[PDB]
Amino acid sequence: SKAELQSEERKRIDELIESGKEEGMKIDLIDGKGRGVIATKQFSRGDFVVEYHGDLIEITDAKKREALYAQDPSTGCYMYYFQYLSKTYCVDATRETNRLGRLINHSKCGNCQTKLHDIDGVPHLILIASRDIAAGEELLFDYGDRSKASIEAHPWLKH
C-alpha cells in the first residue's frame, strides 16, 4: 500500500539523517574541480545518498554571511538556498567539516537530485540518487545557479 511504503521510506531516510552516517563514499581529487566525492558502493535509484549538511539559517543571517565571505577569495562557495513555507532558508556549509555533501561537485547532468525533506517542520536538504550509481562514479548534482554573474565567473556552471 502507498501508505505503509511512505512510512517505511520516511523511517529509512530519517534514520540516516539522524545517524549522520555517510557510508558508501570517499573523497578524491578531480582534475579541474579540486576535491570531489566518489561512490564506493552501488546506490539504487531513489536511495538516500547524503545530507547537504551545514548550518541551517534564515535570510537575514545568510545575507550577513555572504557579505563577509565575498571579502575573502579563498572562502569558496558552499551556501545552498531554498524556499520553505514562504520563507527563504540556506544550508551554509562553508565551514570545513568531515561531512561529504558539501564536497560534491556540480553537473547539470549528474546522478543526484536534492530534495527538501521535512522532519516536523525542520527542513533538511538531502541528495537522493536520480538513477542507479556505479561504484567509482563521481557524485554530482545541479547546483542550480544559472545567473549571468555566476556562469561568467564560473563557466563550468554551464555544463
Binding site: 555572504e66 565571505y69 565575498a70 572562502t75 562557495c77 558552499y78 551556501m79 545552498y80 538556498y81 531554498f82 524556499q83 536534492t114 527538501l116 536538504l125 547546483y143 542550480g144 545557479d145 545567473s147 554573474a149 555566476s150 561568467e152 565567473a153 564560473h154 556552471l157
Partner: peptide, 7 residues
C-alpha cells in the same frame, strides 16, 4: 565573484 547553490 561568488556563485551559490539554489534548490
Amino acid at each position: 565573484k561568488r556563485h551559490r547553490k539554489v534548490l
